[PDB]
Paper text:
It forms part of a putative three-component cytochrome P450 monooxygenase system in [name] comprising CYP222A1 and the [3Fe–4S]-cluster ferredoxin Fdx8 as well as [name]. It mediates the transfer of two electrons from NADH to an iron–sulfur cluster-containing ferredoxin via two successive one-electron transfer steps. The overall structure of [name] is similar to those of other members of the FNR family and is composed of an FAD-binding domain, an NAD-binding domain and a C-terminal domain.
Here, [name] was overexpressed and purified and its crystal structure was determined at 1.9 Å resolution. [name] crystallized in space group P4132, with one monomer in the asymmetric unit. The structure of [name] contains nine α-helices and 25 β-strands, which form three distinct domains: an FAD-binding domain (residues 1–106 and 223–308), an NAD-binding domain (residues 107–222) and a C-terminal domain (residues 309–393). The pyrophosphate moiety of FAD is stabilized by hydrogen bonds between the main-chain amide groups of Ala12 and Leu11 and O1P and between the side-chain NH2 group of Arg119 and O2A, as well as between the Asp260 side chain and the O2P and O3′ atoms of the riboflavin part. The first difference involves the presence or absence of secondary structure in the loop region (residues 51–63 in [name]) of the five ferredoxin reductases. The short and longer helices found in this region in PdR, PuR, ArR and BphA4 correspond to a purely random loop in [name].
Numbering used by the authors: 1 to 393
The structure:
């Protein structure tokens, strides 16, 4: 029997298994999971897992009925493409095709003190146990994850401080103009802008000042880095992530990658995109399955993955929807400026809609997503009215 080996045990790995089976794959499937848990969903870790009574985010995938050999507590540590062999913490195994789906790891600060990052079920459970009335929580970075952790900490009675090097919350992701508009949402947080953090100390954090800010709990949310250090020396093309083409093929034949670990050339956006988004990992698994099962005698084209990216965040009681891929070079146009129903659009030098941000208004996002896909060039009157449809029929 042929053998496809999937390295990693999250959304991309689980969904690739389902897709490979639904689309006719009858060979062997082995999944190498570094974690000692069946794959589970991550968006809930900073949401339900902190706040709700029930929060088991394990996927419904039935690996017994899909004849998937799931190997828990086994991490890949090396790759020998010429031998079609992967090295792991539990020994060697060979493959006929290999899928890299190891996700990304949180960036952390230096220092000796206790420092939480949100990536596993253990992280969320131990962080939840520390979010209690009378606790001082310091969040490093005014990021999506920090905003979500801040929400849960406030609801559980914590004092929250958030230290951001940039000029406004979410400035790294959305820019200073848009981020500045979210300040009222942070009104219950001790938010310190334009402030760098040097390290996590035994008693809290130390600012670039050298000044200290005491804390009972420190949570760092300053981004993630693809988990690719095990690929060192394999000769695979890397660029802060595994480089794949629009068909999720790496630089080496028979080896594929998708999800948070992957950096993908996008014909649409004319650059490499490193978008750690739930929807992008999930959608890529369907494309990847189609690529792997492409009958060689068939003359059909090879499936492509180049969607308009989508991301959401649940914070401060609201729902933020973001679609597209804007550059700092793009022009920001606020929709409904001066009204509570405002949204944000970005257009390029040719007037083409590149991205759109809405709040509690998915109808606006859905229309914007199709407008971006179509390359729509809405006029100023349409952009300034939040309710105006931007997509062609
Ligand atoms: C707290 C949190 C909240 C989020 N909220 C949102 C949200 O609201 N909306 C949104 O769109 N996105 C959200 N995301 C992003 C989204 O969850 C990710 O894009 C998605 O999980 C990526 O799936 P993946 O399978 O590529 O990676 P992961 O889900 O990270 O899976 C990778 C798995 O492989 C394992 N692994 C790592 N190294 C190895 C190795 N060497 N060998 C074997 N296994 C290994 C990891 O332990 C992990 O189990 C959030 C992410 C986090 C962390």
């Amino acid at each position: 029997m042929e053998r496809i080996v999937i390295v990693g045990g999250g959304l991309a790995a689980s969904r690739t298994c389902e897709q490979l089976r639904s689309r006719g794959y009858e060979g062997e499937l082995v999944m190498l999971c570094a974690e000692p848990h069946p794959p589970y969903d991550r968006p809930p870790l900073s949401k339900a897992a902190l706040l709700e009574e029930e929060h088991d985010s394990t996927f419904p995938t039935d690996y017994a009925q899909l004849s998937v050999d799931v190997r828990l507590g086994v991490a890949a540590t090396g790759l020998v493409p010429d031998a079609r062999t992967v090295q792991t913490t539990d020994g060697e195994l060979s493959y006929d095709a290999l899928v890299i789906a190891t996700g990304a790891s949180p960036i952390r600060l230096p220092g000796p003190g206790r420092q939480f990052t949100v990536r596993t079920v253990e992280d969320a459970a131990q962080l939840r146990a520390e979010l209690k009335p009378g606790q001082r929580v310091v969040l490093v970075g005014a990021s999506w994850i920090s905003a979500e952790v801040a929400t849960a900490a406030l609801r559980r009675g914590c004092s929250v401080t958030c230290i951001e090097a940039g000029p406004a919350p979410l400035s790294a992701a959305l820019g200073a103009d848009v981020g500045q508009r979210f300040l009222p949402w942070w009104s219950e947080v001790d938010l310190r802008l334009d402030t760098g953090v040097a390290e996590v100390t035994e008693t809290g954090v130390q600012l670039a000042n050298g000044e200290q800010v005491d804390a009972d709990v420190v949570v760092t949310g300053i981004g993630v880095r693809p988990a690719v250090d095990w690929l060192s020396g394999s000769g695979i093309a890397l660029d802060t992530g595994v480089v794949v083409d629009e068909h999720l093929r790496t630089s080496l034949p028979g080896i594929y990658a998708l999800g948070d670990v992957a950096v993908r050339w996008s014909p649409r956006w004319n650059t490499r995109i490193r978008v750690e988004h739930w929807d992008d990992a999930r959608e890529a698994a369907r494309t990847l399955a189609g690529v792997l099962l492409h009958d060689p005698s068939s003359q059909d084209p090879l499936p492509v993955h180049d969607p308009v990216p989508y991301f959401w965040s649940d914070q401060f009681g609201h729902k933020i929807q973001y679609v597209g891929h804007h550059s700092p070079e793009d022009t920001l146009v606020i929709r409904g400026d001066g009204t509570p129903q405002w949204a944000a659009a970005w257009v390029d030098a040719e007037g083409r809609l590149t991205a759109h941000l809405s709040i509690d208004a998915p109808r606006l996002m859905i229309d914007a997503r199709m407008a971006i896909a179509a390359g729509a060039r809405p006029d100023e009157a349409a952009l300034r009215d939040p309710q105006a449809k931007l997509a062609p029929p």
